Design a protein around this ligand. Structure first.
Ligand SMILES: CCCCCCCCCCCCCCCCCC(=O)OC[C@@H](O)COP(=O)(O)OCC[N+](C)(C)C
Ligand SMILES: CCCCCCCCCCCCCCCCCC(=O)OC[C@@H](O)COP(=O)(O)OCC[N+](C)(C)C
Ligand SMILES: [Zn+2]
Ligand SMILES: [Zn+2]
Ligand SMILES: [Zn+2]
Length: 77
């Protein structure tokens, strides 16, 4: 079990389909709720991580997810 920028592995997996390059889907409730305790500036630090490629994450969709979730703050990356 890990904490990456406020999100557990379970929560990152919950959000994964809403940031996938291929066939993304609308964010789930559990994803949006978890993002309410995530550290966006911390998450932005992963913008160039090889992990985005490995997990098929789209950095643009990832950037867009807080707004999709109706959060008031949004990731400066
Ligand atoms: C900067 C603005 C904010 C950006 C917001 C980003 C939101 C979240 C980004 C999500 C990235 C998702 C990467 C997924 C990594 C999951 C870890 C993993 O490898 O999975 C763990 C497996 O063990 C689970 O597999 P399983 O489902 O349990 O088994 C079937
Ligand atoms: C254009 C706009 C740009 C904005 C960019 C926004 C970027 C958003 C970044 C969020 C990315 C976070 C991805 C982190 C994936 C964690 C991988 C991981 O946790 O590794 C776990 C497994 O590998 C190990 O597996 P295990 O056995 O379960 O270990 C327990
Ligand atoms: Zn652990
Ligand atoms: Zn959490
Ligand atoms: Zn949570």
């Amino acid at each position: 079990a890990i904490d990456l920028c406020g999100m557990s592995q379970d929560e990152l997996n919950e959000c994964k389909p809403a940031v996938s390059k291929e066939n993304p889907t609308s964010p789930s409730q559990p994803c949006c709720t978890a993002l309410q305790h995530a550290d966006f500036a911390c998450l932005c630090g992963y913008k160039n991580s090889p992990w985005l490629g490995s997990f098929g994450v789209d950095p643009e969709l990832a950037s867009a997810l807080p707004k999709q979730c109706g959060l008031a703050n949004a990731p400066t990356c």
